[model samples]
Target: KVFGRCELAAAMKRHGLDNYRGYSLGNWVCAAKFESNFNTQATNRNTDGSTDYGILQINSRWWCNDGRTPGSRNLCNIPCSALLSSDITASVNCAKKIVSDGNGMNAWVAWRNRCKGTDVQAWIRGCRL
Candidate 1:
């Protein structure tokens, strides 16, 4: 499912991502905008044979088990397919795990290159939260 900007902002807030690990809801929204354009089914194949899955694009190498990523740690303890669901609960939980692991929002290069140190407020502008 592809979400509108405010829709995704409200969803992330409902899932407890607001100000998670000192990052604002705007940051999360901005990351999602660049990472997957709010598409829940987004996926990317990496050259390292690991796949990035779902909204936050959790990686198969360290976050989820894809049954094909070599040496996958499955830190999220869920199948990578779980991230593709429109429900997004599993993906959100895994994202929290990524932040709690001390990786911060920098875990996503897209966030670093596009959302980081920028005016993320625009991502959530006019969204009543």
Candidate 2:
């Protein structure tokens, strides 16, 4: 249970996305449900129906698989065994970077710079983890 909840919190915090009507875990969890089924092991068929890789539906075809490289498209280089491996925070940070970037052009760059390798507990507090 700790494993699941821990990762769940990590994923949500990455987005800084409070609920539209209210801040809640429901909407965030739902997105996880559809995207990766809450499974860090998730990978899926793309529009061309090719396999997109990892938790949060990170496509290796689009993002760097180095796990530290921020964005690469090499699937084999990245695996969803994140949260339990070298890329644990990197994987979570990847999503944070994405959502941050989506918010605006420079948003993710700024937030990611702030990541500075804080651990899970400290990371949990920031709306923009």
Candidate 3:
């Protein structure tokens, strides 16, 4: 789950998400850095009593079912545990669903508060992709 920056970037590029859905590659990369530090297993219990899962930290309230969190709309139709795996394919797919929802990565607080407009090009610097 601990991916080197370049390794993470390569995986993202392979999934066609480095520049996905009009959001910059930097945006995704920066979010991964701050949200989970590229750790696939990372989870955060938010102040609002919601849980954030995986590298993108998709919320349990709307995206996935975590069992403990009841009333999950499960928009992604995935289990929360699926997002916590080393294979980020499911995570990326769910993220695509999220971006399509509206306002793009703005749905992620990390993107809006930490990554947006922060000169993130350096996030992908030196990467082969």
Candidate 4:
């Protein structure tokens, strides 16, 4: 795991994701827990034939590259492998750009299924952020 809840909240806040697009850090934290369990190396092949990568499970179809796929938007302009690391700076930056593009956290199905409307103050409990 790349982070416990406390460390994740602090790091995400440091990257300005705590309040990005008016979403709370708890929202992102909850999504991270369910999406990839904070495992930066996590990868899941979707039913649509796309692959999800890294802690937030960003998709290969739209956000990053899997090397096997062609026509990836690569909106973040970073290699997909770059996200699969203990360092979360690139991932956080891409996530912010995603929210700014009007997807918000809606870009992540994990957020819809696990975090939407959930009272997640406990997600950041004991976090210094």
Candidate 5:
């Protein structure tokens, strides 16, 4: 599994998918693994630095630590921090917004597909848990 639920549910909630029934968070954990190998502090190197980010890949260069305190404090909000902080629900709720703006889980899928384009749901397809 990539990331643990304790906050994953909250990450979903942060994205406003409070009712997300993707058959438990295993789906998301698997998705995260596919995204960045579950690196909460993961960052992709870009020339302008407007793309690299944190756990859930928050896009630090643009979202956090670039020119806003809230950017770094994103970990405190519902979506940004949910997967990392104790106030998980709030973080999940916010993540939904990010996803909508086209940088969330679904977006990651698009990026992954660009590489190999597998039509597989890694989480649901390879579950032995």
Candidate 6:
């Protein structure tokens, strides 16, 4: 599923992403924009042979188990396929865990390069959140 900007914003808030780990809703929205463009089925394979999945791009290396990333920690204890679902609940939960695990939003390099230290609030502008 592809979410519109405001729709993603509201969904993130609904899933307790608002000001989560001191990163505002805009931060998450912006991360999703550059990470997967709000597409639930998005996936990216890293050079390490691990993959990233879902709207937030939770990774297989340390987050979800894809049965391919050898020695995966699978800290989220979730199958990587779950992140690709349209519901987004599993992806969001993993995202919270990623941040709460002391990585903060830095877990996503795209966020650091594109959304971090920038006017991320603009990502949520004109939205009714």
Model 1: ten consecutive residues of lowest lDDT: 99-108
Model 5 lowest lDDT segment of ten: 73-82
Sort the predicted structures by TM-score, highest score first. Answer: 6, 1, 3, 4, 5, 2
User: Can you rank all candidates by lDDT, best first?
Assistant: 6, 1, 3, 4, 5, 2
lDDT per residue for candidate 2 within 94-127, as digits (tens), equals: 5544555444212223223432232323423443
TM-score: the better of candidates 1 and 2:
1
Global lDDT scores for all candidate models: 0.93, 0.43, 0.89, 0.85, 0.43, 0.94
Structural similarity to truth (TM-score) of each candidate: 0.97, 0.45, 0.95, 0.94, 0.47, 0.97
Clashing pairs in 4: none
Give the range where candidate 6 is weakest over 10 consecutive residues by summed lDDT. 101-110
> What is the model-wide C-alpha lDDT for candidate 2?
0.43
TM-score of model 4 (CA atoms)? 0.94
Please identify model 5 stretches exceeding 4 Å from their true place.
1-27, 67-91, 102-106, 109-120, 125-129
Clashing pairs in 1: none
Q: Write the per-residue lDDT of candidate 3 for residues 12-107, one digit (tens) a residue.
A: 888888668898787888999999999999999977677999999999999998887776689999999999999999999999999989779899
- Model 1: per-residue Cα lDDT at residue 92: 94
Q: Judging by lDDT, tell me the better candidate of 3 and 4.
A: 3
Off by over 4 Å in 6: none
Q: Which stretches in model 1 have alpha-carbon errors above 4 Å?
A: none
Query: Cα RMSD (Å) between model 6 and the true structure?
Result: 0.7
What TM-score would candidate 2 get against the native? 0.45
Q: Indicate whether candidate 2 or candidate 5 has the larger TM-score.
A: 5
